[PDB]
Structures are given as structure tokens and as C-alpha cells.
Amino acid sequence: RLIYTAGGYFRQSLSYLEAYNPSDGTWLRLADLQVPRSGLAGCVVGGLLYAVGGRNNSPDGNTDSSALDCYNPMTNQWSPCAPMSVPRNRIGVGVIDGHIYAVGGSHGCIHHNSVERYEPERDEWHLVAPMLTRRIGVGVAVLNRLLYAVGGFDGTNRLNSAECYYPERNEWRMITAMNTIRSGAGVCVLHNCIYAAGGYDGQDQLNSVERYDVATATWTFVAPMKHRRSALGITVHQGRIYVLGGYDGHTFLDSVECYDPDTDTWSEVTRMTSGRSGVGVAVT
Template sequence: MALSHAFFNQNSRMLCPRKKKQPCLKNCTAIAVPSMKGHGYLDYTIENHTSKAFEKMDEMRRNNLLCDVLLRVSYNGKEEDFHVHKIVLASCSPFFRAMFTNNFRECHAREVTIKDICPKVMQRLIEFAYTSRITVGEKCVLHVLLAAMRYQMEDVAKACSDFLVKHLDASNVIGISNFAEQIGCHELYRTGREYINTHFSEVTNEEEFLSLSHCELLDLVSQDSLNVLCESEVYNACLKWMQWDLNNRAQYFHALLNAVHLYSLPAKFLEIQLKKCPILSKENRCRVYLSKIFQEMCLHKPLPRPKQRGNQLIYVAGGYLQNSLSSMDAFNPQTGEWIKLADMLEPRSGLGACIVSGLFYAVGGRNNSCQENTDSDLLSFFNPVTNQWASRAPMNVPRNRVGVAEIDGAIYAAGGSCGSEHHKSVEKYDPDNDRWTFVAPMPTARIGAGVVACRGRLYVVGGFDGDTRWNTVDCYDPEEDQWQPVASMETIRSGAGVVALDNYLYAVGGYDGTNQLDSVERYNIERNYWEAMAPMKHRRSAHGLTVHQGKIYALGGFNAGGFLSSVECYCPDRNEWTEVTVMPTGCSGMGVAVTMEPCPQLCDKNEEN
């Protein structure tokens, strides 16, 4: 019976009598439909319907069934044909969608010729369109990525990018980054550049780096985002690149020097280069340029504020809270986050801290814990690249509440105490020889003094000699090995924080023998006088004080209310303090300094442990 007859008859309730349970269409002109009033609606989904449908379409493709276009793919004289369905390619590629829907010639063509793509690569893209699966390896991933970008198949491009990111290393990252930039794969390019910035020193040891053009190298070393321990790493990388082909590359030395942050180099490093660098003996213009900067450093003239590479963090080591602490944390002012790092080798409070060649040095202090209570002569350093501590030669005498600063790569440890003895002695540490030597002692014994270096000289501010708290300030000249007094502060301060910023010294907080202080005063080095500045939000002594990107940060400390966890930031332009964060643990007597951001993978690993 033809199905064109009326299939349903609203007036009929009769079923075909041939079978009691099943309707039969033979010899029937109508089927009765029972009423379903009041039973709602059915919403039913077959979860694997789409995948099963695409499986059938892929099967039809492989058997050339219902295919409406033939892709003739040619590459290097080789040609291969692929029968496909336009709608499938158009559904996952804006390129093919435009080709088949926008009245181009190919829109109605039964055959389309595609050149300059390997047929095997095209086969992978076609199979992905039907199956959502893509398989790539080291030999083909770049070819597949190039094709995916060309035909705008974002999911394939992301899969290839993820594969390449997973296999980035120092030997291939430059090539992969350049390739990503050329084909417009921005995310892969960004990730590659981040890898170069983070692993710059490793990358410079590879042949890809040495094969860079001078323009590519100049672009690379001009990046402030390079994460290096010391600017000397950038300078040495430029030397290494030139020495690879000295006859042809020496001409670019001056241009490269303009990209190096020369005022961030230690004067001692520049002196060695001027004496021993063979390239400078040939490139007189570069020699004159570096000599001028070196002379400015030696004459202690006001210098431009050194530029910092990469993201710099504030590191906080040790401290005191009922007991001496061994913790090491870093604060990122850009994100407001604290990072937990490897603990010190032993608990210490009252220690000094400074940065030499990007390494965080912890000097002296006291181990006041349940097991012992001893003053320390220890010297150790933390490497943010490896997230590890290492010991170095101890000082000649233990020094608790010691003042520490760095001048031209040497560490100076001034004053401090051992038991009841308050030191006026000062020691100098040479990292190259791992050795401490005494220099001229201070005129007055001091513990809890603020010690800071500025323009090649060492300043010791305030402090306590066991009987008297001081407002006096003494200045040490390393070249003359002599001390001389300069203008005294307006306020007596021990346990104050002292930093140098833009040719000023800032003395912040402290203890005057009666109260913790919130007051701040600033020393004008050129004119030899102190002036009052805006006070902090909190009174504090034995706190951490450091400079980060032109602003002063005061961390923790102690006052009549107990141990502080608050962190304040001072803006010299506005002469104003603002509270910015709280420390993971409130404490006093910690070592604080600023250096490069640690490797993220190492930080994550430490937090897991």
C-alpha cells in the first residue's frame, strides 16, 4: 500500500485486526493514535550520536561515498588526491569555509588543487576534521603546525604548540620561537620568549644563540625581561657571540654595548674588562666608552639609577618570633603574592643581608632556638636560579645584629655583638677568594646600626654600644681605609632600617631607648644634612627595609604591641607611606634584600615539599 495515503485519521480508533499487538499497514488506510494528554514532553539526547555520525562520514570518505570535492595536493613534484566532503572541512577550518561558501571559483568546483603542502600533512588535517584526533612527532610537528596555521585549524595548531612547549629546551627554543613568530603563532612565540628570558644563561651556551644575526642578538639583549643574576651575564653573552666570528662581528660591539645596562655592572668587572678583554684592545671606540663609565664609578659621581632585568622580588630570610627562624620567603610587589622558598641551613635572627652578583648573602646573626642560643659567624648564600643555599667561609668573629652592605662586589660586615662584647671591628669578604679580612674599625662600637653603601662608600647610622644609643653617622672610604664622621641624625635610633635611594640615605623607624619610632629622616649626601620625611603608619624597630623599583618597603619588626606582620611602601615623589600587604609570619630581625625572581618550577616544587 502506498504511503501517500492518509497516515493518521483523527476520527479512527481502530487497529488492524491481523495482529492484536502490532499495527499492520497492509489493507489499512488509517492507524488510530491513542491520546497522550497531560503527560508532558520528552527531551532525549544520544551522547555519542555526533561521534558515531562522524565515524560513518569518515567511512564514507575512505570509500569515496557522497564526497563532493577532490583535493589534489602537490608538493615538490609529488601529487596525491583526497576525496572529501566540503561541509566537514568547512566546519573546522575558516579557510575552507570561505573557499566553499563565498562564491570563489572553488565553491562549485569538483576538483581543487592545493600546492606547497606535503600530502601526508594534508592527510593528517583531513583525518582530524573527521575524527578529532591528531598525532604529531618531532619530525612532522613543525610541518603540521605550519599547515594548521595556514588553514586556520586552531585546535590542531594548539595541539602542535602544546607539544613544542613541552619539548622546549635551551638548544631549540630560539629556532622554535623564530618559527612561531614567522607563521603568526603568537602564543608559542610568547612562551618561547619567556623560556629564553628565564633560561638566558643556558641558551647562550647553545649553537642557536651563536648563530643569531646581529639584529636578532641586539633585539634579545635589549629586553628588560631577561631574568639574569647579574648584568655581567648579558655582557659576557655578547662577547661570546662576537668571538664565534670575531673578524665579522667585532664591528657590532658598540651597538651591543648600548643595549647592555652598563651602570649595573660592578666597577671591578669593568676594570677587568678594560685590562684583559682582547676585543677592547682592537675596538678603541668601545674602550673609550667603557673607560668613561668606569671613571664615573671610581669618582663616586651621582650615577643613573641602575636598570634591573627581569622581575625583581623582595626576599626575607630568617628573623625572630619566640625563636630564631630558618624560613625564606619572597614577596612579589607586582602581584602581591608571597612565595615560599628553601629554608636556610639553620635558624638565624639579627642577621644582615645583601646581594652580590644576584646571589642573596646571609651574614651572621644568632641561632636562638630550643636547641641552642649562640651568636653566629656564618656566611651563606641563596641562589634564586636553583632555590638552594650554600655555605661560604665564616667571619673571623660571630656578629649578632650586624650591619651589612656591598661595595663593588665585596661584602662589609660592621659591628654586631658576640655575647656581651659589642664590636667596633669591620670585616670585608671577597667572594672570588672566599676570604674575610679585617679593615679599619669604626670609631664607635655598634650593634643594631643601619649600614648602607652609596656611591662607593659605607655609612653606619645610629646603633647601640651597650651603654648608649646613637644618632651619629660614620662614613668609610674603602680606597683610603679610613672612617670619618658626617652630620648626625635628628633622632637617636638603634634597630632602624637604613637604605640608599637616589643619592639620599633614609633612616626609618628604630628605637630611641624609650619607644619604637615611626619617624623617618633623609640624609642629603651632597649637602651633608638630615631632614624629616613623612612618618610610617606603624612604629617599628628591628624591621626589614629595602628598595624595590624606586620605592622603599618596610617589613615586619617589633613594637609595644608585639611582632609586626604589616608591610608598608614609601613613595619618595609623594612623600607618602601606604600599607601594601602582610607577611606570612610576623617577626623581627630578618635579612631583607632584592634580587631576581626565582624559577617558577622550583618554587612550585618547594611548595609541594
């Protein structure tokens, strides 16, 4: 399977889309986004890539995006899908049972607690029960058919909270907080363990990575990345974690690091074409 990157920001939101294969280590340029947008998330359902939320390039008035769009790698064609109820810049996303869950994100000065679910069958959104916190820069990631809305910023406090959602009950549960504060962290599940790689805390942009096992309900640290970064893209391919892009305060990273859980070691496997922050990453 190929890993992708959609959108991104480099002094300007980027309309790019690219693809990568770990078996040969090569980059493949693909059909550019119809509207450029950073601060967005991406995912795949039914072998079609999706590019949820973000922020338009403009640059005029106010343009946070409530925009859902779908890509077909076989035909290489972008379609426009039903737009979310509210704009969501700095958004996370997760998928349960073939539905797409938009969680949080900013719209102007408003930092959303609201959440909405997308059915591809029908092509429409349904506003679900909101989170207990407000969260922009929020890492979403799914563990055994439950949605963990990790970290974020609420409008005044950068947070270490990492509440969880129960689709069967339709309610949110405030579980155990992270050791390190993380706004703009990247989160993706692997082997019954949620991971929180990098982000921004206050002074420092972080390189530290920590891992959440459910029962014990504790955040055990893991080997940190080489480069410190928030706003990174993140995903999993073949029992390893791949961390694309970043914003280290002073530069936009073109690095791509790979975490091997089998050894607890980070290793760079390549470099992107042009370094950017705020991509939407997925795998098919």
C-alpha cells in the first residue's frame, strides 16, 4: 500500500498531493487539490482518499474551510463531497465502521467542541454529541472501534487531555491526561497502543513520543524523534509509524521519520520534495 500527503503549508497553503512506497522509497506526483489548504486531515474509506477540513489560501477576509473532498487513485480524479456543518481548521479525524468523524478544529476565533459524522453511502454529515473540551490542533486516532481525541488547545490552555468517544452510547469520557502538553501533535494507533508524537507545549517544540495502553491507563514514553516538530502528518504502514512534515518554530521540515516498535528506534527513510506543515495523511 502507498502512503499519501495532501495539502500542506509553506508560507502559503499548498494544493499538492504526493505518494510514497516504503518497498522502493520513491515519490510520485499526483493530481493537485482543486483548492489549496493546510491545517487539514485526510483518511481513506473504501479505497478512496478523503481530504477533510483545513484553511483556504485566499488570503482575504476570513476563510477557514468546511470542505470535504474525495480522490480516486485509480482514476486520479478529485471530487467534491458534502461540506461539513461548520469550518474546521486544525482538525483531526478517525474512521469507525466506514464513517468519517470530523472532530474539533477552529473557525475564526471559535474553537470547536462540536463533532460530526459522514456517511459515504448517503454523502451527508450528522452533528453528533460534542466533546467535553474545545480542541484545535487535535490528534484523533481510533483504537478498537473507539475514537480518542487526544491533546489540543481550547482557546486559552494548551492541553494534555485525551478524552475518548463511545459510538454505541454516543458520549465522551475524560480519560487519563498526557505527561507532556501537546498542541499540534500527530496521533495514529498501532498494536493496541495510541501514540502522541511531537507537538508544541510553550517554549519548546517537542521531539518526545509517548504511548497509551488502555487498561493500565498510563502514558509511557517511547524513543523520541530526531527532529522536533508540531503540525506533522502521521500514519502507519506495515507495523511501523511514518511522520511526514513538521513545524519546528523556525523552519518547515521536509523530513520523514519511521518508528520501528520492534526495536524502539527512529530512522529517517527519505525526504519530501518541499518541506511543509499541515498535511492530511492516509494509506491505501
